[PDB]
Write a protein that binds this ligand. Sequence first.
Ligand SMILES: [Mg+2]
Ligand SMILES: [Mg+2]
Ligand SMILES: [Mg+2]
Ligand SMILES: [Mg+2]
Ligand SMILES: [Mg+2]
Ligand SMILES: [Mg+2]
Ligand SMILES: [Mg+2]
Ligand SMILES: [Mg+2]
Ligand SMILES: [Mg+2]
Ligand SMILES: [Mg+2]
Ligand SMILES: [Mg+2]
Ligand SMILES: [Mg+2]
Ligand SMILES: [Mg+2]
Ligand SMILES: [Mg+2]
Ligand SMILES: [Mg+2]
Ligand SMILES: [Mg+2]
Ligand SMILES: [Mg+2]
Ligand SMILES: [Zn+2]
Lengths: 258, 134, 181, 140
Amino acid sequence: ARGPKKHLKRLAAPHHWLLDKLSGCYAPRPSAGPHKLRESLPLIVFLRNRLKYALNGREVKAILMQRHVKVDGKVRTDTTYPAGFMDVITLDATNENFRLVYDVKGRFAVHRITDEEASYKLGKVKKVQLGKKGVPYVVTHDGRTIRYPDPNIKVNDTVKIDLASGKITDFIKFDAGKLVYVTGGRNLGRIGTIVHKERHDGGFDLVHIKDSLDNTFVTRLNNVFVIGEQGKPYISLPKGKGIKLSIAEERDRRRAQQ
Amino acid sequence: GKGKPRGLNSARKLRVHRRNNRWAENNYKKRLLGTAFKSSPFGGSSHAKGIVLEKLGIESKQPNSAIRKCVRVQLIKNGKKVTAFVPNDGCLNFVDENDEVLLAGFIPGVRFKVVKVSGVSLLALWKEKKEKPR
Amino acid sequence: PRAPRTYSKTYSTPKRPYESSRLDAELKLAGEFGLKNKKEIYRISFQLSKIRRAARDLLTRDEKDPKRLFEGNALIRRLVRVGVLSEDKKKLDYVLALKVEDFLERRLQTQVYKLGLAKSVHHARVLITQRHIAVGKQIVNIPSFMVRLDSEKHIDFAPTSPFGGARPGRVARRNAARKAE
Amino acid sequence: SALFFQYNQAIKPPYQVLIDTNFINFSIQKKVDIVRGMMDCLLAKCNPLITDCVMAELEKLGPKYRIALKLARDPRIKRLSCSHKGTYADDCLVHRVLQHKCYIVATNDAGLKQRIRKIPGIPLMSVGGHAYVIEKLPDV
RNA sequence: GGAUAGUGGCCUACCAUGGUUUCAACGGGUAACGGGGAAUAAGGGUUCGAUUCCGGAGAGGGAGCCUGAGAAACGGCUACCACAUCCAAGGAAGGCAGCAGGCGCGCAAAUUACCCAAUCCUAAUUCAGGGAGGUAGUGACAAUAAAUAACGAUACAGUUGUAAUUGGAAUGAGUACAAUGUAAAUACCUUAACGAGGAACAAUUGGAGGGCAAGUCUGGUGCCAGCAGCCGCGGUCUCCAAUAGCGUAUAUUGUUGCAGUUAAAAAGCUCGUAGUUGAACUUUGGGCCCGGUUAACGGGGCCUUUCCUUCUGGCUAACCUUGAGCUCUUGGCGAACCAGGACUUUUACUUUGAAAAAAUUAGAGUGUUCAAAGCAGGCGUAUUGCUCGAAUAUAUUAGCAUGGAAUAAUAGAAUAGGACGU
RNA sequence: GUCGACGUACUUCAUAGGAUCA
Ligand SMILES: [Mg+2]
Ligand SMILES: [Mg+2]
Ligand SMILES: [Mg+2]
Ligand SMILES: [Mg+2]
Ligand SMILES: [Mg+2]
Ligand SMILES: [Mg+2]
Ligand SMILES: [Mg+2]
Ligand SMILES: [Mg+2]
Ligand SMILES: [Mg+2]
Ligand SMILES: [Mg+2]
Ligand SMILES: [Mg+2]
Ligand SMILES: [Mg+2]
Ligand SMILES: [Mg+2]
Ligand SMILES: [Mg+2]
Ligand SMILES: [Mg+2]
Ligand SMILES: [Mg+2]
Ligand SMILES: [Mg+2]
Ligand SMILES: [Zn+2]
């Protein structure tokens, strides 16, 4: 190619979107934004294929141009805006608030939250550095640059950000025993507690996580997201609380409830 | 020892020995060198066009004889003359001198049978479903 | 371009179609069940071969294997649901004991014949293809329709059919009008 | 009554199969298990059966064929009694199939195969190439 | 040093003479874009992959550029090579390997169709544009389902067979008010009214076998045999296979695991480099404790001459002790464990975990009327509504982390230039 | 030139043996 691409084939789209393979030939390409293309849920998919409020892309555009949708407290009018992990989506007309958190299966879930919980979000500190004029700042996983951070905040920590002011209200250090959420790999969507961080210089650090059922799994440090102390997450968790269940157990539960 | 290397680090000798020896097969040699169609009756084609020179058995007394169904045809591709069968003398009426005939593989020595004449199937003509265009 | 839509062949030619015993078996099957052609028998044989190969492969797995347990239970549940396998024979060994006749008996043609709605398998086929048979509230015109155990008790004449309480067909009212005139 | 023209409508799974003396040799030679090889070939449970004539025939073979004798005595292989004096297994095997039409004959002798072939409705199993083959069995 | 966004012989100046190769360089062939994938196969293997996704390259062939964040762009420009259109002969304009449609033969094959309604893309932008894309049309590409009759009576013939016999019931192929469908239409699903006895509302493709004459031809141990018989004096038949499909032609090596006396193939003999292969030996056994499975099986700890070393830091067990009732508490001592710095033989092999896009393959659930499929859907309903899914496995080699320490290599103390130290 | 050698593609000749019966 001679420049950036602008089209996305349906078969090439992220699997977790759960798009019909025969509905069309193209899928919404997420516009540039806070979250990476493959880790993001464009607003069209959320409003149409998840909430079912809109029956087609044109109706999604009609909804957005009415300014009814806010992402992290700010109105967005782009159909393919890349909403992503820990993003608060507010619909005032419906009096509804959502937080985009993976379910255990590895797909963004329709998780409703309260207004108080919609006032803040969490962000993994991806970088900490001095800017111009010697003003320290932290860069989080959604591209937010926050100046004058608490000096104790280091990389891999999780900062609680207030959406109204975009200021750090609280922070959580990365340490053993902390409650974490897996945001990548085949263990995506699971919740557990750190046991041990294996450090390899010049390579990828691995973290061993123990879930509530005592199962243990190893994941790269890039996919880990601290969300609180054990049993006391800073956010309301989805149904199932991030616990993986074997196919037989899922069958048993499904038959029991049916 | 069976006359072959068996050491665990002898893969190269086994590969190279095999590659040299596959050329002994005639099937392999023909397949790679693209000479498998020299033996084919039509030189690689499934059908051949020809020009009807003469009907050799037109005069034979016994009706529907094997000789009566033979026609001497000239292959257009190379000009070699060959003999071809006709399904029956009734079909032999349709075939006449100087028509293009499509031949297919089949009195020993006759290895071809006519399937089309003047671009029309003989079986279509024999069943009275088409007319020969001239 | 749009993504491909999958397709598959529901039958296969047998290894030796020309075995005399095989020819006689196909003749008996077609006559007993009123099958149109050997394609239907090949189709049922292909399904049965697939099922039995799956069962054999599961049996090769060690007992208590999670894959064996899950897949074998699902397969046995399906076979019991369609009616081929009896309730008391819920094991993979009895899945290998199935035969083409078991599947053929479940066809809507044979069931319509057996329930007394038709006087022969051919009469049942004609009744089905002419839209006289309803499984529940749904008219079914496919003789190969495989009846489930629950569906077995709901086969009846369709509400729209002349035999099911609707008005007489075209011939009946035609003749009635000609008699009246 | 069990035969419809040349089609046997009585032989149904699980099958009862008579093991011939030479069948065991080629089963061993080709490294094919008796119980599973029949399961793979027919996709059904098979009940191998060894008669007294074949069993006596095996014992006469000698020390060389000890493995075949050990396999023949595996507990899964049921035994069939004989009420006849002669010990020739081929004659015994031909006799039983004539009486009752439910048995598969597993053998590799050309001569015995021809005699069974003349009898109608007798599936005839053999071991060739890499696994077992069944000839006259429509349900396959 | 120059140049580039930047590393770099990328180029320049000066220097050295280096770099690859029998573990196959270099050169040649390729009817060579690579992969996900497809077929076959019991397994190893063999072959196919222009072709729905990803990546690369090209826009007739070389070369060079403007603009711009991004192009060595070609539905942008300039030159040359080959073609080729208009011309008043002075000049001007070209690139379908985009969608339709032509030529390339004298022998052949989709429509120069409708639309942005869905999918998404572009813009100043909800609105315009989109031959991208969808819709319909068009050679049986590849696939799913499935009509062409069912129930009786009579008749005739050797309880069987045959009906241009006969009775009144059923229905869609088709036609068509209508409605639904659709951007508008066609079609599907529905449905008034028509639509069946030769049900002429006229199923096909191959194969086998007969029999008939004042007939024709050929041969001869008479009247016969072979070939065969649409043709004679006048006159203008049965069965078999598949089935909305069927026929014809071409094509379609042993690692596991081959053979070498007498019927393929052991070199005349020896030496010998690469390559492959290469004797045995170094912690074995014994005594206890802990917790798991179904008395067996496996997993951990100690002890046995068997603990990595060192420093620093964090916490602090146990041990000594005071006091208050095995538990708290005073004051010392601080093992174990954790974190970091130094210290360090290297691999082969195998176990476990991440990674190996989606689609595809296998596979769970689901009455698309069944099915191929699709990822849907399901339950109540006077009213407002509730709710389950979109699982799971596979994937070689290389790279990464990890437990083993059998097997096979590798290094060490010999002129001690060796180890250790309060 | 019905030329030699080679390469390629084909054609062809070598199949009956034992037992019983007349
Ligand atoms: Mg790094
Ligand atoms: Mg030896
Ligand atoms: Mg109707
Ligand atoms: Mg220079
Ligand atoms: Mg290729
Ligand atoms: Mg090429
Ligand atoms: Mg390709
Ligand atoms: Mg280009
Ligand atoms: Mg061109
Ligand atoms: Mg260019
Ligand atoms: Mg163009
Ligand atoms: Mg272009
Ligand atoms: Mg074109
Ligand atoms: Mg403006
Ligand atoms: Mg050497
Ligand atoms: Mg050794
Ligand atoms: Mg690996
Ligand atoms: Zn016996």
